[PDB]
Write a protein that binds this ligand. Structure first.
Ligand code: SF4
Length: 298
């Protein structure tokens, strides 16, 4: 099998659907939307419909990094990667199976929202693992677009050549460090990976729509001004500043939303990125490149 039996069982206990090297998991906000009509911050920022979003990955347990906030639950060989048409159908089928779990509480959801959740519109390729290690990621994105889905892809940015090729609706680069020392401390990566990430920053301006997401951990990377030169080098459309969310680390390592706002305002005061929105629920601030202004709403 592609995944060790122990890992497979652990992921199933974490409520992952797994088929080969591909996985889908219901985002916690989908549940809150279905049962409480609560929207996620991506709905607020970008106009996405929370209950119509698939959270998935084509590379569930393969990633080059070893971050301090990753794998709270390194020698697994890479699988024989499946064709992108197959990965696409498996993602849609696993998502359908998860949404069908609401059939037994239709009166708590309502038939309208149920029928809408069965017709997803948005795909967040961001669940676990590094999507660019899947060698047909570009093709997979194209298939989603031709079938009417918007795509968000979150990448660590190491594989510059893949970032150059792909064109999701919005490309996220995780940037949780600002020099080699902090990169090793936080991401557990090699110095060669950090240099490659910097090369990726240089070409992000060539992409159609970009966002850097920085996950802030108290005392590890929360000196926000140390990121400014990298953010300016990257010249992306948006930045998301987000607190670490606990459960290796402790709950006290989370930043208060007021601290996220403080750091976002400092970033605003010291950079060409301007604070334009925030969500206390998810402890995230949205900043916009004042020299590359585009509408945040998709
Ligand atoms: S856009 Fe991100 S936060 Fe919103 S439902 Fe999808 S995965 Fe969850």
């Amino acid at each position: 099998h592609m995944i060790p039996e122990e890992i497979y069982k652990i992921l199933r206990k974490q409520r992952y659907q797994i088929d080969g090297h591909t996985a889908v998991k219901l985002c916690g906000w989908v549940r809150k939307k279905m049962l409480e009509d609560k929207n996620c911050y991506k709905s607020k920022f970008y106009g996405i419909e929370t209950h119509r979003c698939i959270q998935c990955t084509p590379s569930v347990i393969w990633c080059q990094q070893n971050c301090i906030f990753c794998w709270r639950v390194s020698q697994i060989k890479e699988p024989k990667w499946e064709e992108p048409e197959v990965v696409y159908e498996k993602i849609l089928a696993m998502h359908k199976r998860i949404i069908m779990g609401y059939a037994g509480v239709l009166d708590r959801v309502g038939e309208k929202k149920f029928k809408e959740a069965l017709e997803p519109k948005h795909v967040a390729i961001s669940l676990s693992g590094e999507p660019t290690l899947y060698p047909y990621l570009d093709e997979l994105i194209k298939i989603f677009h031709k079938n009417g889905f918007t795509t968000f892809v979150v990448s660590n940015g190491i594989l510059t050549d893949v970032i150059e090729k792909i064109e999701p609706t919005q490309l996220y680069i995780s940037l949780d460090a600002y020099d080699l020392d902090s990169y090793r401390r936080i991401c557990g990566g090699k110095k060669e990976y950090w240099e490659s990430i910097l090369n990726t920053l240089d070409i992000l301006k060539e992409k159609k729509r970009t966002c850097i997401r920085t996950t802030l951990i108290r005392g590890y990377n929360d000196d926000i001004l140390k990121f400014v030169e990298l953010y300016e080098r990257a010249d992306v459309h948006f930045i998301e500043l987000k607190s670490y969310m606990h459960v290796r680390l402790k709950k006290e390592d989370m930043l208060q939303h007021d601290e996220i706002l403080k750091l976002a305002k400092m970033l605003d005061e010291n950079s060409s990125y301007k604070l334009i929105d925030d969500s206390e629920d998810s402890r995230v601030a949205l900043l916009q490149n004042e020299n590359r202004k585009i509408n945040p709403k998709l």
